[PDB]
Amino acid sequence: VFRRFVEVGRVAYVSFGPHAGKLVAIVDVIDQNRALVDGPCTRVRRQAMPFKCMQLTDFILKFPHSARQKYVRKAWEKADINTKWAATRWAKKIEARERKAKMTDFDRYKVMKAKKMRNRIIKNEVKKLQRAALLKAS
Amino acid sequence: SGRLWCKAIFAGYKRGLRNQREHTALLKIEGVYARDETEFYLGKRCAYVYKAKNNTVTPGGKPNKTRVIWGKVTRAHGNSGMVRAKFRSNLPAKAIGHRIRVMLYPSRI
Amino acid sequence: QVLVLDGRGHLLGRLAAIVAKQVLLGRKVVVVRCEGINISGNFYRNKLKYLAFLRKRMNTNPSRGPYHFRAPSRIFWRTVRGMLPHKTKRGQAALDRLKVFDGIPPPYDKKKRMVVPAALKVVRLKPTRKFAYLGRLAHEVGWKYQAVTATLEEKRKEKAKIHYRKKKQLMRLRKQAEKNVEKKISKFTDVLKTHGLLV
Amino acid sequence: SHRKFSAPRHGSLGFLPRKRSSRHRGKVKSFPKDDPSKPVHLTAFLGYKAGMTHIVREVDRPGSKVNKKEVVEAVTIVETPPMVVVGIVGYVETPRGLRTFKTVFAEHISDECKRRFYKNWHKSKKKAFTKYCKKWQDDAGKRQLDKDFSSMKKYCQVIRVLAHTQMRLLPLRQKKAHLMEIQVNGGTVAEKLDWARERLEQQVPVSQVFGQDEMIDVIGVTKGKGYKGVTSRWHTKKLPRKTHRGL
Amino acid sequence: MKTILSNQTVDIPENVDISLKGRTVIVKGPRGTLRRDFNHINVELSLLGKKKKRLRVDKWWGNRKELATVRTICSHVQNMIKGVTLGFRYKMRSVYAHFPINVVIQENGSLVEIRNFLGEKYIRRVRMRPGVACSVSQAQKDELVLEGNDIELVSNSAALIQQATTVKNKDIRKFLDGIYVSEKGTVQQA
């Protein structure tokens, strides 16, 4: 079954293009493979953008099918999509990607040194529980 | 203590369909698959390391059996991350499909 | 350094075109589960495609004619050979790097198999189209080891299930291990989150 | 143009490679398939052609002109001395075909079977299986033999037996026995293996394998006739007398 | 063109208790359980409404051919409901001119013996499909009664013996013999 539906007012994430990585809200559906869309608060001017470069989210804000850009911005701020999007696990692992991408060589060394002893404690912790299980298994 | 060069495969010479120009080599560097990512490797020095029978000298070491053909990375080729390179002497065709090294010391950063 | 490609769900010509380019680049490619290779088009189309291929033989001496291979591994080996300059020295040196197998050999059962998403039925074919399995096609034209391979492939299916269920329990103890020890690993944890590795 | 009057071709193409046989002993290319319901039994035997003679018998076929009449039939005489089982062989089954798993021989092998392992018996020192027969009087050897037998319990699908004929009882000039794998068809692998272990170094008469009024198959090598022309080998039409380069 | 959405809701009764996983539905109730797979069509099956009183199929962006295949699912699910509520009773006559077509059933409704069909020495042996029960009714001579729950299996077995009793190389306009399907009903009525 489907849980996300292309419909008037669904907040979407842009896959590729000049506006990739931003949020955008569906206003109207133009054609079978293209829809009229408007990201008034995410620096996305009102334009036509196809279904090719959009990933549709589980966020629905209500406004009429051909409402102007004023009401879309007001509904965006009333629902407060920007704060809720940052609290989504979708965006938390999105923003971690550029943190790995901008990671400096000095930052690369500190991650490697921290990964060593962090795995040391877990392996030592796991080692204590395999031997503790076998006494409990007998 | 480790590698200081990027892995590249000598795919073949710059060629047509029925004419090859073996004075320009085509390189497939591992990790690059687009034209816009080939800008970093432009101007880098490439070398084809191979070993032979007779012992030849080595700068700063005892004379070994290894030999090289020095060259440089000239410009990008194609669209899917390929790139052209030019060597002092033309690469032998025994090196087709073999690993050659592209170094970083011609650095622009 | 060796590409182990699982042949299940892979299109014959799309996988062979990618393997042939990788093999010519000095990369050793091992294609496994060639009975899982499937071909677009209905089953009756491909059968006469192979049956009319069988009819093509030398009249004066069929022993010198086309060698019609009936195994799924050798059928896939045939279509890669037609995608390579096998009449030259570098073409035959390439074919030595290719190694095809029906089922999964014990050299390759305890290894991770790579998958080409570009050479996949679910990606390149419409859901309403029809496709034909090479494993069914091979046994239906002269291969004698379909039920033979099926039982040996069946044997390793629960053998890997024992390893996998042990693998889940092995890392179930691992995931529960952090749950007791956050107080003394938070120094290493936060710096792994600022650089984006556990967020 | 086309052939004026149609006629079938001379000679079958299923026996096309009319070469000298690479083997002298008949080979079972396809053994009978087995089902676990039947008890363990032998499926093949090896005999020697003696001669032929007449027979007189009553025919009991209904509906015929020859019903309840005395006839004569040409019958072959095949002298079939009992075999001596000298070993067994196991076969694991692969996607590439059928592969032998392990061959286990007897402790002591009769010298009739030892003739086969030598091209020249006169010059040889008869040293075959001398160190292999040392495995049966050491405690590590018996445990290894049982480990080899236990390995064939798990992995082997098809089990054959190695038995040889007895040249001492035959009046032939040669003394070199013929080894032969005979597939044992019967129950499951485990009792099949135990039956062949018991039958080691034992006499196997003909009555265990075959019975009366039973269809069997005869495998052998044709009588040699040497280099022959198309008229004798292929039975082609002889050309007329007026031919210049022969007929 | 592509029709944006098509659907057809199947109202199920109280006696039938259906459920679905993936694209395969199961139908159970009084007379047993029936299962049928629909992986060849790539549609959406949705079982909504409380007390599960209806089942609705969906097909998004469908065209003229496959929207026709949406309706035949509704016919197939309804036939599974009918076979679990009321079953399927198929009654077949035995038409013969001269030779009486002898019929007898071995192993309790799974095998049919047909003897003396057009006075033939050959005896015809048809194996009934699993889940189908075969018997001769009473109070009338020429009847062979097939019982079951799945409409595909019962009518195929009816067509097995109808095709098993055919007259070869004869003027069938004059020779009107064989076992033919007469009545297509259910086990119990309502």
Add this chain to the structure above:
Amino acid sequence: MKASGTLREYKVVGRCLPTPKCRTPPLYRMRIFAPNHVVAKSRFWYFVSQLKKMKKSSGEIVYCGQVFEKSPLRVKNFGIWLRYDSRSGTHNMYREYRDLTTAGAVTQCYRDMGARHRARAHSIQIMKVEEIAASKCRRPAVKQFHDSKIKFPLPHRVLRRQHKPRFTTKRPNTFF
């Protein structure tokens, strides 16, 4: 005329040269859809030469300019009339499209007609594009989008960027 890229609407007017017989010739305006203005004036003289006794030598271009979309952010329904050429005989059509711009609908018309009837752009003579209301639409493909509560998923998402992970481990998921 090569229907390259997206089309542009050009408002080209023209008249005959002044003659001793006639003081000022009348002015003729047309709606021309063309990639650029160089091929628009050539296409302008093609249709004018059919309707009137006019040629490019005896005529001139008074104003060649491009008109822009008045409501490019409003989704609209366009009615487009056809005068294409087939292999046997010539036919007229009325076709409906749903696009933001008039030039885009003509662009969508040129690509659709070549896809369906294999008609080239030189064989197609556009005559009239008119904005029509949603209630006056005729083709059910256009009318199915006239829904205030239109709602549909993306059932079979054909995944792209298939070659950047050319060799991967996990089987890809075509469902979101």
Add this chain to the structure above:
RNA sequence: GGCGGUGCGCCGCGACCGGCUCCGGGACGGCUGGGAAGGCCCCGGCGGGGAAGGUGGCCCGGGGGCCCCGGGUGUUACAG
């Protein structure tokens, strides 16, 4: 030792200048319909209208049972 000339045994590197090319990053300006559109000022303010891809509200139906899905009227009503 300093100046001028020629060259380095072999293997190489670097710097600047000039010529011929390919590519990238910044900032400035002109024309249009002296851009079209679009954003803000309550829907920018006031007045007058219209229907529909009908928002409140009303009626009917169904799903738990207090929100959603359909059908009908309507003219901004708690959306446009």
Add this chain to the structure above:
RNA sequence: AGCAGAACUGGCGCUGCGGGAUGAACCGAACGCCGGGUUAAGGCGCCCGAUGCCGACGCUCAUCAGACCCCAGAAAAGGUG
């Protein structure tokens, strides 16, 4: 008729090169020996250099599908595909 005979112009003969799998006449373009760059005609899944573009819009299922001038094969008619 890849037949015979004419008119204008261009080619082959006399001419190599890139492309059309190959090819006297087709397309592009004519040639001293080279390096760099850029194209014509053609192409860019592998052979085989080049799309491994997050290519656009539609059509089409063939149990004889279709795939590029020259050019190498097809008609009237019919189809509730």
Add this chain to the structure above:
RNA sequence: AUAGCCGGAGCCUCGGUUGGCCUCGGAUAGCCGGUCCCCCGGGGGUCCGGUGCGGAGAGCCCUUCGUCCCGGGAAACGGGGCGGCCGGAAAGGGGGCCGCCCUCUCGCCCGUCACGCACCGCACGUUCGUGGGGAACCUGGCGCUAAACCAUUCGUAGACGA
């Protein structure tokens, strides 16, 4: 059956490479992992969480400048030494477990002390590499004392071979 097996250094020749991933099955109009309150002898069912897979190949594991001390965190089960034991047959591993007589909280992460041709800017550096093969040199132990062909004979065979 074999007139080679185990373990040390130097010389020619052949060459390629410059960290390993040790694995569920399977779908694509659907999946994944846990709770098992449920039912039977591992499956089904329910529930809870993720699903542009983060119990993610856009990933994971190891990380090596070395030596000397001292202090802090972990560690006391742990690191490393020989025998068995089993698990492997589709083309089969030096894989794990039991006890060993010696080894240290030395292993690793942070911080102190000091040292290491600092070869004075420059290239094939850095591994897999006790790599494969071949002669000769080593040291000892453990061992094995064979077949094929020609000749002759046979004639179930045959132009000659076979």
